[PDB]
């Protein structure tokens, strides 16, 4: 067989993780007078820290699925839309002091 | 067989995790006069810290599923929409001091 | 067989991770009076730090799937749209002091 | 067999990761009065730091899939659109003080 | 067999990664009154730092797939569009003080 021997003496291990992976000041504003909106944002962000680790120690790991990590994401969408007639009309006849704002988006970071 | 021998003496292990993975100041505002909105944001953010760990120690791990981690997400959507007629009308006749704002979005970070 | 022998003495291991992988000031604004919007942004950002690690120690790892990491993302979309007639009309007859703004987007970083 | 022997004495390992992989000030604004928008931006940015690591130590790793890492992304889209008639009309008859702005985008970095 | 022997004594390893791989001030603005937009930007930017590492130590790694890393991205799109008639008309008859701006984009970096 296979002997595995590990000797540790007077070691000093330190792992510090600070302010990692935080989410601050996020705004989700879908809409705006649309018809169909499928809103599925997906986050898989991994922030990993490690210090002085070690893996698995197996002897003859054979047969089937051993130490298998499987991840499956299914996001198959089917979106259908039937519209007889769609009109976006801005009808401003006559005369005066008129100011019409439609779908106006403003971003001021400052 | 396979002998596994581990000796530890006078070790010092330290793992510090501070302010990791927090969620602050998140706003979800879907809508806006739409028709169909499927709002499924998905978060899988992993913030892991470790220090001086060790894996599994198995002898002949064979047969079937052994130490198998499986993750499956099913987000299959089926969205259907039937509209005979859709009108977005801004009709401003006559004359005066008129100010019409429709679907106006403002972001001031300052 | 295969002997694996490891001797560690008077080591000093340090892993520091600070302010890594954070998400700040993100704005999602889909819409704007559209018809079909499939909004699926996907994030797989990995920020990894390590110090003094070691892998797996296996003896004759043979048969099936051993130490297999599998990731599968399925984002197959099927978007259909049927419109009899789509009109975007800006009809401004007559005479006065008229200011019409449609789909105006402003970004001021400052 | 194959003997693997490792001796470490009076080592000093340090791995520092600071402000890596952060996402700040991102704006997603799809729309603008379109018909079909498939919005699937994909991020796979890997920011890795390491110091004094070591790989796997296997003896006769043969048979099937051993230490196999597999990643599969499926983003096959099928977008269909049928429009009988699409008109974008800016009809400004008559006479006055008229200012019409359509799909105006402004970026001021300053 | 093949003996692998490694002796380390009084080493000093340091790996510093600072402000690497960050994403700041990104704006995604698709749309503008189009018909079909498939918006799939893909990021695979890898920013790696390492110091004093070592690979795998295998003895007779033969059979099947051993230490195989596989990455597959499938972004096959199928976009179809049928339009009976598409008109972009700017009809400005009569007489006055008229200023019409359509699809005007301005970038001021300053």
Short mmCIF file of C-alpha atoms in Angstrom, two decimals:
data_model
loop_
_atom_site.label_atom_id
_atom_site.label_comp_id
_atom_site.label_asym_id
_atom_site.label_seq_id
_atom_site.Cartn_x
_atom_site.Cartn_y
_atom_site.Cartn_z
CA UNK A 1 0.00 0.00 0.00
CA UNK A 2 0.86 3.68 0.12
CA UNK A 3 1.91 5.22 3.43
CA UNK A 4 1.21 8.94 3.93
CA UNK A 5 3.14 10.55 6.79
CA UNK A 6 2.96 14.23 7.76
CA UNK A 7 4.94 15.94 10.52
CA UNK A 8 4.18 19.51 11.58
CA UNK A 9 6.07 21.32 14.34
CA UNK A 10 6.10 24.97 15.44
CA UNK A 11 3.97 26.21 12.56
CA UNK A 12 2.04 29.48 12.44
CA UNK A 13 -0.97 29.66 10.12
CA UNK A 14 -3.06 32.81 9.65
CA UNK A 15 -5.90 33.50 7.22
CA UNK A 16 -7.55 36.93 7.29
CA UNK A 17 -10.54 37.84 5.11
CA UNK A 18 -11.95 41.35 5.47
CA UNK A 19 -14.75 43.15 3.62
CA UNK A 20 -14.83 40.58 0.80
CA UNK A 21 -17.85 39.82 -1.37
CA UNK A 22 -20.13 42.52 0.01
CA UNK A 23 -22.94 43.95 -2.12
CA UNK A 24 -23.73 47.62 -1.52
CA UNK A 25 -26.02 50.11 -3.28
CA UNK A 26 -27.67 47.93 -5.93
CA UNK A 27 -30.88 49.09 -7.62
CA UNK A 28 -33.06 46.82 -9.77
CA UNK A 29 -35.64 48.87 -11.67
CA UNK A 30 -37.18 46.83 -14.51
CA UNK A 31 -40.37 47.91 -16.20
CA UNK A 32 -40.81 51.23 -17.96
CA UNK A 33 -44.12 50.33 -19.57
CA UNK A 34 -42.90 47.28 -21.49
CA UNK A 35 -45.01 44.22 -22.36
CA UNK A 36 -42.96 41.14 -21.40
CA UNK A 37 -39.89 41.30 -19.15
CA UNK A 38 -38.09 38.16 -17.98
CA UNK A 39 -35.75 39.42 -15.26
CA UNK A 40 -33.39 36.65 -14.11
CA UNK A 41 -29.91 37.98 -13.28
CA UNK A 42 -27.72 35.20 -11.90
CA UNK A 43 -24.76 35.62 -9.54
CA UNK A 44 -22.11 32.92 -8.98
CA UNK A 45 -19.29 35.09 -7.61
CA UNK A 46 -16.95 33.02 -5.39
CA UNK A 47 -14.49 34.88 -3.08
CA UNK A 48 -12.38 32.20 -1.41
CA UNK A 49 -9.44 32.52 0.97
CA UNK A 50 -7.42 29.66 2.42
CA UNK A 51 -4.15 29.05 4.25
CA UNK A 52 -2.36 25.77 4.93
CA UNK A 53 -5.04 23.35 3.77
CA UNK A 54 -4.77 19.84 2.33
CA UNK A 55 -6.95 17.70 0.10
CA UNK A 56 -8.42 14.23 0.40
CA UNK A 57 -6.34 11.13 1.11
CA UNK A 58 -8.05 8.11 -0.45
CA UNK A 59 -6.79 4.58 -1.07
CA UNK A 60 -8.01 2.95 -4.30
CA UNK A 61 -11.01 5.29 -4.87
CA UNK A 62 -12.49 3.43 -7.81
CA UNK A 63 -16.06 2.68 -8.84
CA UNK A 64 -19.07 4.82 -9.63
CA UNK A 65 -18.84 8.51 -8.74
CA UNK A 66 -16.32 9.28 -5.99
CA UNK A 67 -15.71 12.84 -4.72
CA UNK A 68 -17.73 14.20 -7.65
CA UNK A 69 -19.07 17.75 -7.34
CA UNK A 70 -21.76 18.53 -9.93
CA UNK A 71 -23.53 21.85 -10.50
CA UNK A 72 -26.29 22.31 -13.08
CA UNK A 73 -28.25 25.49 -13.79
CA UNK A 74 -31.25 25.34 -16.13
CA UNK A 75 -32.51 28.74 -17.28
CA UNK A 76 -34.26 27.85 -20.54
CA UNK A 77 -36.91 30.48 -21.24
CA UNK A 78 -39.83 30.35 -23.73
CA UNK A 79 -41.31 33.85 -24.30
CA UNK A 80 -44.21 34.35 -26.72
CA UNK A 81 -45.98 37.58 -27.62
CA UNK A 82 -48.92 38.27 -29.92
CA UNK A 83 -50.02 41.87 -30.49
CA UNK A 84 -52.64 42.90 -33.03
CA UNK A 85 -51.49 46.52 -33.10
CA UNK A 86 -49.06 48.53 -30.95
CA UNK A 87 -49.05 52.33 -31.12
CA UNK A 88 -46.84 54.78 -29.22
CA UNK A 89 -48.36 58.17 -30.08
CA UNK A 90 -47.29 61.62 -28.86
CA UNK A 91 -50.04 63.85 -30.28
CA UNK A 92 -49.54 67.49 -29.28
CA UNK A 93 -51.78 69.76 -31.39
CA UNK A 94 -52.85 73.32 -30.65
CA UNK A 95 -50.56 75.90 -29.14
CA UNK A 96 -49.29 76.85 -25.70
CA UNK A 97 -46.41 76.20 -23.29
CA UNK A 98 -46.16 72.41 -23.49
CA UNK A 99 -43.30 70.20 -22.31
CA UNK A 100 -43.82 66.45 -22.74
CA UNK A 101 -41.23 63.98 -21.43
CA UNK A 102 -41.63 60.28 -22.19
CA UNK A 103 -39.23 57.52 -21.11
CA UNK A 104 -36.68 60.10 -19.94
CA UNK A 105 -33.86 58.59 -17.87
CA UNK A 106 -31.34 60.74 -16.01
CA UNK A 107 -28.19 59.61 -14.19
CA UNK A 108 -26.24 62.21 -12.18
CA UNK A 109 -23.31 60.63 -10.35
CA UNK A 110 -21.82 63.92 -9.08
CA UNK B 1 -3.39 -1.24 3.21
CA UNK B 2 -2.49 2.43 3.36
CA UNK B 3 -1.41 3.93 6.68
CA UNK B 4 -2.06 7.64 7.21
CA UNK B 5 -0.11 9.20 10.08
CA UNK B 6 -0.25 12.88 11.09
CA UNK B 7 1.75 14.54 13.87
CA UNK B 8 1.04 18.11 14.96
CA UNK B 9 2.95 19.87 17.73
CA UNK B 10 3.03 23.52 18.86
CA UNK B 11 0.91 24.80 16.00
CA UNK B 12 -0.99 28.10 15.92
CA UNK B 13 -4.01 28.33 13.61
CA UNK B 14 -6.06 31.50 13.17
CA UNK B 15 -8.90 32.25 10.76
CA UNK B 16 -10.51 35.70 10.87
CA UNK B 17 -13.49 36.66 8.70
CA UNK B 18 -14.87 40.18 9.09
CA UNK B 19 -17.65 42.03 7.27
CA UNK B 20 -17.77 39.48 4.43
CA UNK B 21 -20.80 38.78 2.26
CA UNK B 22 -23.05 41.49 3.67
CA UNK B 23 -25.85 42.98 1.56
CA UNK B 24 -26.59 46.65 2.19
CA UNK B 25 -28.86 49.18 0.46
CA UNK B 26 -30.54 47.04 -2.20
CA UNK B 27 -33.74 48.25 -3.87
CA UNK B 28 -35.96 46.02 -6.03
CA UNK B 29 -38.52 48.12 -7.91
CA UNK B 30 -40.09 46.12 -10.76
CA UNK B 31 -43.27 47.25 -12.43
CA UNK B 32 -43.68 50.59 -14.16
CA UNK B 33 -47.01 49.75 -15.77
CA UNK B 34 -45.83 46.70 -17.72
CA UNK B 35 -47.97 43.67 -18.61
CA UNK B 36 -45.95 40.56 -17.68
CA UNK B 37 -42.87 40.67 -15.45
CA UNK B 38 -41.11 37.50 -14.31
CA UNK B 39 -38.74 38.70 -11.58
CA UNK B 40 -36.41 35.89 -10.47
CA UNK B 41 -32.92 37.18 -9.64
CA UNK B 42 -30.75 34.37 -8.29
CA UNK B 43 -27.78 34.73 -5.93
CA UNK B 44 -25.16 31.99 -5.40
CA UNK B 45 -22.32 34.13 -4.02
CA UNK B 46 -19.98 32.01 -1.82
CA UNK B 47 -17.50 33.82 0.49
CA UNK B 48 -15.42 31.10 2.13
CA UNK B 49 -12.46 31.37 4.50
CA UNK B 50 -10.47 28.47 5.93
CA UNK B 51 -7.21 27.80 7.74
CA UNK B 52 -5.45 24.51 8.38
CA UNK B 53 -8.16 22.12 7.21
CA UNK B 54 -7.93 18.63 5.73
CA UNK B 55 -10.14 16.53 3.49
CA UNK B 56 -11.65 13.07 3.76
CA UNK B 57 -9.60 9.94 4.44
CA UNK B 58 -11.35 6.95 2.86
CA UNK B 59 -10.13 3.41 2.20
CA UNK B 60 -11.38 1.83 -1.04
CA UNK B 61 -14.35 4.21 -1.58
CA UNK B 62 -15.87 2.39 -4.53
CA UNK B 63 -19.45 1.70 -5.56
CA UNK B 64 -22.43 3.88 -6.32
CA UNK B 65 -22.16 7.55 -5.40
CA UNK B 66 -19.62 8.27 -2.64
CA UNK B 67 -18.97 11.81 -1.35
CA UNK B 68 -20.98 13.22 -4.26
CA UNK B 69 -22.28 16.78 -3.91
CA UNK B 70 -24.97 17.61 -6.49
CA UNK B 71 -26.71 20.96 -7.02
CA UNK B 72 -29.46 21.47 -9.59
CA UNK B 73 -31.39 24.68 -10.26
CA UNK B 74 -34.40 24.58 -12.60
CA UNK B 75 -35.63 28.01 -13.71
CA UNK B 76 -37.39 27.17 -16.97
CA UNK B 77 -40.02 29.84 -17.64
CA UNK B 78 -42.94 29.76 -20.13
CA UNK B 79 -44.39 33.28 -20.66
CA UNK B 80 -47.29 33.83 -23.06
CA UNK B 81 -49.03 37.10 -23.93
CA UNK B 82 -51.97 37.83 -26.22
CA UNK B 83 -53.03 41.45 -26.74
CA UNK B 84 -55.64 42.53 -29.27
CA UNK B 85 -54.45 46.15 -29.31
CA UNK B 86 -52.00 48.10 -27.15
CA UNK B 87 -51.95 51.91 -27.28
CA UNK B 88 -49.70 54.32 -25.37
CA UNK B 89 -51.18 57.73 -26.19
CA UNK B 90 -50.08 61.15 -24.95
CA UNK B 91 -52.81 63.43 -26.33
CA UNK B 92 -52.26 67.05 -25.30
CA UNK B 93 -54.49 69.37 -27.38
CA UNK B 94 -55.52 72.93 -26.61
CA UNK B 95 -53.19 75.47 -25.08
CA UNK B 96 -51.90 76.38 -21.64
CA UNK B 97 -49.02 75.67 -19.24
CA UNK B 98 -48.81 71.88 -19.48
CA UNK B 99 -45.97 69.63 -18.33
CA UNK B 100 -46.54 65.88 -18.80
CA UNK B 101 -43.97 63.38 -17.51
CA UNK B 102 -44.41 59.69 -18.31
CA UNK B 103 -42.04 56.90 -17.25
CA UNK B 104 -39.46 59.44 -16.07
CA UNK B 105 -36.65 57.88 -14.02
CA UNK B 106 -34.10 59.99 -12.15
CA UNK B 107 -30.96 58.80 -10.35
CA UNK B 108 -28.98 61.36 -8.32
CA UNK B 109 -26.06 59.73 -6.52
CA UNK B 110 -24.53 62.99 -5.22
CA UNK C 1 3.40 1.26 -3.20
CA UNK C 2 4.22 4.96 -3.11
CA UNK C 3 5.24 6.54 0.19
CA UNK C 4 4.50 10.25 0.64
CA UNK C 5 6.40 11.91 3.49
CA UNK C 6 6.17 15.60 4.43
CA UNK C 7 8.13 17.36 7.18
CA UNK C 8 7.33 20.94 8.20
CA UNK C 9 9.19 22.78 10.95
CA UNK C 10 9.17 26.45 12.02
CA UNK C 11 7.04 27.64 9.12
CA UNK C 12 5.08 30.89 8.96
CA UNK C 13 2.06 31.01 6.64
CA UNK C 14 -0.06 34.13 6.13
CA UNK C 15 -2.90 34.77 3.68
CA UNK C 16 -4.59 38.18 3.72
CA UNK C 17 -7.58 39.03 1.52
CA UNK C 18 -9.03 42.52 1.84
CA UNK C 19 -11.85 44.27 -0.04
CA UNK C 20 -11.89 41.68 -2.82
CA UNK C 21 -14.89 40.86 -5.00
CA UNK C 22 -17.21 43.56 -3.65
CA UNK C 23 -20.03 44.93 -5.81
CA UNK C 24 -20.86 48.60 -5.24
CA UNK C 25 -23.17 51.05 -7.03
CA UNK C 26 -24.79 48.82 -9.66
CA UNK C 27 -28.01 49.93 -11.38
CA UNK C 28 -30.16 47.61 -13.50
CA UNK C 29 -32.75 49.61 -15.43
CA UNK C 30 -34.26 47.53 -18.26
CA UNK C 31 -37.46 48.55 -19.97
CA UNK C 32 -37.94 51.85 -21.76
CA UNK C 33 -41.23 50.91 -23.37
CA UNK C 34 -39.98 47.85 -25.25
CA UNK C 35 -42.05 44.75 -26.10
CA UNK C 36 -39.96 41.71 -25.10
CA UNK C 37 -36.90 41.93 -22.85
CA UNK C 38 -35.07 38.82 -21.65
CA UNK C 39 -32.75 40.13 -18.93
CA UNK C 40 -30.36 37.39 -17.75
CA UNK C 41 -26.91 38.77 -16.92
CA UNK C 42 -24.68 36.04 -15.51
CA UNK C 43 -21.73 36.51 -13.14
CA UNK C 44 -19.05 33.84 -12.55
CA UNK C 45 -16.27 36.06 -11.19
CA UNK C 46 -13.90 34.04 -8.95
CA UNK C 47 -11.48 35.95 -6.66
CA UNK C 48 -9.34 33.31 -4.95
CA UNK C 49 -6.41 33.68 -2.57
CA UNK C 50 -4.36 30.86 -1.08
CA UNK C 51 -1.09 30.30 0.76
CA UNK C 52 0.74 27.06 1.48
CA UNK C 53 -1.92 24.59 0.33
CA UNK C 54 -1.60 21.07 -1.08
CA UNK C 55 -3.75 18.88 -3.29
CA UNK C 56 -5.18 15.40 -2.96
CA UNK C 57 -3.07 12.33 -2.22
CA UNK C 58 -4.75 9.27 -3.74
CA UNK C 59 -3.44 5.75 -4.33
CA UNK C 60 -4.64 4.08 -7.55
CA UNK C 61 -7.65 6.38 -8.15
CA UNK C 62 -9.11 4.48 -11.07
CA UNK C 63 -12.67 3.68 -12.10
CA UNK C 64 -15.70 5.78 -12.92
CA UNK C 65 -15.52 9.47 -12.07
CA UNK C 66 -13.01 10.30 -9.32
CA UNK C 67 -12.44 13.88 -8.08
CA UNK C 68 -14.47 15.19 -11.03
CA UNK C 69 -15.85 18.72 -10.76
CA UNK C 70 -18.54 19.45 -13.36
CA UNK C 71 -20.35 22.74 -13.97
CA UNK C 72 -23.10 23.15 -16.56
CA UNK C 73 -25.10 26.30 -17.30
CA UNK C 74 -28.09 26.09 -19.65
CA UNK C 75 -29.39 29.47 -20.84
CA UNK C 76 -31.11 28.52 -24.09
CA UNK C 77 -33.80 31.12 -24.83
CA UNK C 78 -36.70 30.93 -27.32
CA UNK C 79 -38.22 34.41 -27.93
CA UNK C 80 -41.13 34.85 -30.36
CA UNK C 81 -42.93 38.06 -31.29
CA UNK C 82 -45.87 38.69 -33.61
CA UNK C 83 -47.01 42.27 -34.21
CA UNK C 84 -49.63 43.25 -36.77
CA UNK C 85 -48.52 46.88 -36.88
CA UNK C 86 -46.12 48.93 -34.74
CA UNK C 87 -46.16 52.74 -34.95
CA UNK C 88 -43.98 55.23 -33.06
CA UNK C 89 -45.53 58.59 -33.96
CA UNK C 90 -44.51 62.06 -32.78
CA UNK C 91 -47.28 64.25 -34.22
CA UNK C 92 -46.82 67.90 -33.25
CA UNK C 93 -49.08 70.13 -35.39
CA UNK C 94 -50.20 73.68 -34.69
CA UNK C 95 -47.94 76.30 -33.20
CA UNK C 96 -46.68 77.31 -29.76
CA UNK C 97 -43.80 76.71 -27.34
CA UNK C 98 -43.51 72.92 -27.50
CA UNK C 99 -40.63 70.75 -26.30
CA UNK C 100 -41.11 66.99 -26.70
CA UNK C 101 -38.49 64.57 -25.35
CA UNK C 102 -38.85 60.85 -26.08
CA UNK C 103 -36.42 58.14 -24.96
CA UNK C 104 -33.91 60.75 -23.82
CA UNK C 105 -31.07 59.30 -21.72
CA UNK C 106 -28.58 61.49 -19.87
CA UNK C 107 -25.42 60.41 -18.03
CA UNK C 108 -23.51 63.05 -16.05
CA UNK C 109 -20.56 61.52 -14.20
CA UNK C 110 -19.12 64.84 -12.95
CA UNK D 1 6.80 2.53 -6.41
CA UNK D 2 7.57 6.23 -6.35
CA UNK D 3 8.57 7.85 -3.07
CA UNK D 4 7.78 11.56 -2.65
CA UNK D 5 9.66 13.27 0.19
CA UNK D 6 9.38 16.96 1.09
CA UNK D 7 11.31 18.77 3.84
CA UNK D 8 10.46 22.34 4.83
CA UNK D 9 12.29 24.24 7.56
CA UNK D 10 12.23 27.91 8.60
CA UNK D 11 10.09 29.05 5.68
CA UNK D 12 8.09 32.27 5.49
CA UNK D 13 5.08 32.34 3.15
CA UNK D 14 2.93 35.43 2.61
CA UNK D 15 0.08 36.01 0.15
CA UNK D 16 -1.65 39.40 0.15
CA UNK D 17 -4.64 40.20 -2.07
CA UNK D 18 -6.13 43.68 -1.78
CA UNK D 19 -8.96 45.38 -3.68
CA UNK D 20 -8.97 42.76 -6.45
CA UNK D 21 -11.95 41.89 -8.62
CA UNK D 22 -14.31 44.57 -7.31
CA UNK D 23 -17.14 45.89 -9.48
CA UNK D 24 -18.01 49.55 -8.95
CA UNK D 25 -20.34 51.95 -10.77
CA UNK D 26 -21.93 49.68 -13.39
CA UNK D 27 -25.16 50.74 -15.12
CA UNK D 28 -27.27 48.38 -17.23
CA UNK D 29 -29.88 50.33 -19.18
CA UNK D 30 -31.36 48.20 -22.00
CA UNK D 31 -34.56 49.18 -23.72
CA UNK D 32 -35.08 52.45 -25.55
CA UNK D 33 -38.35 51.45 -27.16
CA UNK D 34 -37.06 48.40 -29.01
CA UNK D 35 -39.09 45.27 -29.84
CA UNK D 36 -36.97 42.26 -28.81
CA UNK D 37 -33.92 42.53 -26.55
CA UNK D 38 -32.06 39.46 -25.31
CA UNK D 39 -29.76 40.82 -22.59
CA UNK D 40 -27.34 38.12 -21.39
CA UNK D 41 -23.90 39.55 -20.56
CA UNK D 42 -21.65 36.85 -19.12
CA UNK D 43 -18.71 37.38 -16.75
CA UNK D 44 -16.01 34.75 -16.12
CA UNK D 45 -13.25 37.02 -14.78
CA UNK D 46 -10.87 35.04 -12.51
CA UNK D 47 -8.48 37.00 -10.22
CA UNK D 48 -6.31 34.40 -8.49
CA UNK D 49 -3.39 34.83 -6.10
CA UNK D 50 -1.31 32.05 -4.58
CA UNK D 51 1.96 31.54 -2.73
CA UNK D 52 3.82 28.33 -1.98
CA UNK D 53 1.20 25.81 -3.11
CA UNK D 54 1.56 22.29 -4.48
CA UNK D 55 -0.56 20.06 -6.68
CA UNK D 56 -1.95 16.56 -6.33
CA UNK D 57 0.20 13.52 -5.55
CA UNK D 58 -1.44 10.43 -7.05
CA UNK D 59 -0.09 6.92 -7.61
CA UNK D 60 -1.26 5.21 -10.81
CA UNK D 61 -4.30 7.47 -11.44
CA UNK D 62 -5.73 5.52 -14.35
CA UNK D 63 -9.27 4.67 -15.39
CA UNK D 64 -12.33 6.73 -16.23
CA UNK D 65 -12.18 10.43 -15.41
CA UNK D 66 -9.70 11.32 -12.66
CA UNK D 67 -9.17 14.90 -11.46
CA UNK D 68 -11.21 16.17 -14.42
CA UNK D 69 -12.63 19.69 -14.18
CA UNK D 70 -15.33 20.36 -16.80
CA UNK D 71 -17.17 23.63 -17.44
CA UNK D 72 -19.92 23.97 -20.05
CA UNK D 73 -21.95 27.10 -20.82
CA UNK D 74 -24.93 26.83 -23.18
CA UNK D 75 -26.27 30.19 -24.40
CA UNK D 76 -27.97 29.19 -27.65
CA UNK D 77 -30.68 31.75 -28.42
CA UNK D 78 -33.58 31.50 -30.92
CA UNK D 79 -35.13 34.95 -31.57
CA UNK D 80 -38.03 35.34 -34.00
CA UNK D 81 -39.87 38.52 -34.97
CA UNK D 82 -42.82 39.09 -37.31
CA UNK D 83 -44.00 42.66 -37.94
CA UNK D 84 -46.62 43.58 -40.52
CA UNK D 85 -45.55 47.23 -40.66
CA UNK D 86 -43.19 49.32 -38.53
CA UNK D 87 -43.26 53.12 -38.77
CA UNK D 88 -41.12 55.66 -36.90
CA UNK D 89 -42.71 58.99 -37.83
CA UNK D 90 -41.73 62.49 -36.68
CA UNK D 91 -44.52 64.63 -38.15
CA UNK D 92 -44.11 68.30 -37.21
CA UNK D 93 -46.39 70.47 -39.38
CA UNK D 94 -47.55 74.02 -38.72
CA UNK D 95 -45.33 76.68 -37.23
CA UNK D 96 -44.10 77.73 -33.81
CA UNK D 97 -41.21 77.19 -31.37
CA UNK D 98 -40.88 73.40 -31.50
CA UNK D 99 -37.97 71.28 -30.27
CA UNK D 100 -38.40 67.51 -30.63
CA UNK D 101 -35.76 65.13 -29.25
CA UNK D 102 -36.08 61.40 -29.95
CA UNK D 103 -33.62 58.73 -28.80
CA UNK D 104 -31.14 61.38 -27.67
CA UNK D 105 -28.30 59.98 -25.56
CA UNK D 106 -25.84 62.22 -23.72
CA UNK D 107 -22.67 61.19 -21.86
CA UNK D 108 -20.80 63.87 -19.90
CA UNK D 109 -17.84 62.40 -18.02
CA UNK D 110 -16.44 65.74 -16.80
CA UNK E 1 10.19 3.81 -9.64
CA UNK E 2 10.92 7.52 -9.61
CA UNK E 3 11.88 9.18 -6.34
CA UNK E 4 11.06 12.88 -5.95
CA UNK E 5 12.90 14.64 -3.12
CA UNK E 6 12.58 18.33 -2.25
CA UNK E 7 14.47 20.19 0.48
CA UNK E 8 13.58 23.76 1.44
CA UNK E 9 15.37 25.70 4.16
CA UNK E 10 15.27 29.38 5.17
CA UNK E 11 13.13 30.47 2.23
CA UNK E 12 11.09 33.67 2.01
CA UNK E 13 8.09 33.68 -0.34
CA UNK E 14 5.90 36.73 -0.91
CA UNK E 15 3.06 37.26 -3.39
CA UNK E 16 1.29 40.64 -3.42
CA UNK E 17 -1.71 41.38 -5.66
CA UNK E 18 -3.24 44.84 -5.41
CA UNK E 19 -6.09 46.49 -7.33
CA UNK E 20 -6.05 43.84 -10.07
CA UNK E 21 -9.02 42.92 -12.25
CA UNK E 22 -11.41 45.58 -10.97
CA UNK E 23 -14.25 46.85 -13.16
CA UNK E 24 -15.17 50.51 -12.67
CA UNK E 25 -17.52 52.87 -14.52
CA UNK E 26 -19.07 50.56 -17.12
CA UNK E 27 -22.30 51.56 -18.87
CA UNK E 28 -24.39 49.16 -20.97
CA UNK E 29 -27.01 51.06 -22.95
CA UNK E 30 -28.45 48.89 -25.75
CA UNK E 31 -31.66 49.81 -27.49
CA UNK E 32 -32.21 53.07 -29.34
CA UNK E 33 -35.47 52.01 -30.96
CA UNK E 34 -34.13 48.96 -32.78
CA UNK E 35 -36.12 45.80 -33.59
CA UNK E 36 -33.97 42.83 -32.52
CA UNK E 37 -30.93 43.15 -30.26
CA UNK E 38 -29.03 40.11 -28.99
CA UNK E 39 -26.76 41.52 -26.28
CA UNK E 40 -24.32 38.86 -25.04
CA UNK E 41 -20.90 40.34 -24.22
CA UNK E 42 -18.62 37.68 -22.74
CA UNK E 43 -15.70 38.27 -20.36
CA UNK E 44 -12.96 35.67 -19.71
CA UNK E 45 -10.24 37.98 -18.37
CA UNK E 46 -7.84 36.06 -16.07
CA UNK E 47 -5.48 38.07 -13.80
CA UNK E 48 -3.29 35.50 -12.04
CA UNK E 49 -0.38 35.99 -9.64
CA UNK E 50 1.72 33.24 -8.09
CA UNK E 51 4.99 32.79 -6.22
CA UNK E 52 6.89 29.61 -5.44
CA UNK E 53 4.30 27.05 -6.56
CA UNK E 54 4.71 23.53 -7.90
CA UNK E 55 2.63 21.25 -10.09
CA UNK E 56 1.27 17.74 -9.71
CA UNK E 57 3.46 14.73 -8.89
CA UNK E 58 1.86 11.61 -10.38
CA UNK E 59 3.26 8.11 -10.90
CA UNK E 60 2.12 6.36 -14.09
CA UNK E 61 -0.95 8.57 -14.75
CA UNK E 62 -2.34 6.58 -17.65
CA UNK E 63 -5.87 5.69 -18.69
CA UNK E 64 -8.95 7.69 -19.56
CA UNK E 65 -8.85 11.41 -18.77
CA UNK E 66 -6.39 12.35 -16.02
CA UNK E 67 -5.91 15.95 -14.85
CA UNK E 68 -7.95 17.16 -17.83
CA UNK E 69 -9.41 20.67 -17.62
CA UNK E 70 -12.11 21.29 -20.26
CA UNK E 71 -13.99 24.52 -20.93
CA UNK E 72 -16.73 24.82 -23.55
CA UNK E 73 -18.79 27.91 -24.36
CA UNK E 74 -21.77 27.59 -26.73
CA UNK E 75 -23.14 30.92 -27.98
CA UNK E 76 -24.82 29.87 -31.23
CA UNK E 77 -27.56 32.39 -32.02
CA UNK E 78 -30.44 32.09 -34.53
CA UNK E 79 -32.04 35.52 -35.22
CA UNK E 80 -34.93 35.85 -37.66
CA UNK E 81 -36.80 39.00 -38.67
CA UNK E 82 -39.75 39.52 -41.02
CA UNK E 83 -40.97 43.06 -41.69
CA UNK E 84 -43.59 43.93 -44.28
CA UNK E 85 -42.57 47.59 -44.44
CA UNK E 86 -40.23 49.73 -42.33
CA UNK E 87 -40.35 53.53 -42.60
CA UNK E 88 -38.25 56.11 -40.75
CA UNK E 89 -39.87 59.41 -41.71
CA UNK E 90 -38.94 62.93 -40.58
CA UNK E 91 -41.75 65.02 -42.08
CA UNK E 92 -41.38 68.70 -41.18
CA UNK E 93 -43.69 70.83 -43.37
CA UNK E 94 -44.89 74.37 -42.74
CA UNK E 95 -42.70 77.07 -41.27
CA UNK E 96 -41.50 78.16 -37.85
CA UNK E 97 -38.62 77.68 -35.40
CA UNK E 98 -38.24 73.90 -35.49
CA UNK E 99 -35.31 71.81 -34.24
CA UNK E 100 -35.70 68.04 -34.57
CA UNK E 101 -33.03 65.70 -33.16
CA UNK E 102 -33.30 61.96 -33.83
CA UNK E 103 -30.81 59.33 -32.65
CA UNK E 104 -28.37 62.02 -31.53
CA UNK E 105 -25.52 60.67 -29.40
CA UNK E 106 -23.09 62.96 -27.57
CA UNK E 107 -19.92 61.98 -25.70
CA UNK E 108 -18.08 64.70 -23.74
CA UNK E 109 -15.11 63.28 -21.85
CA UNK E 110 -13.76 66.65 -20.65
#
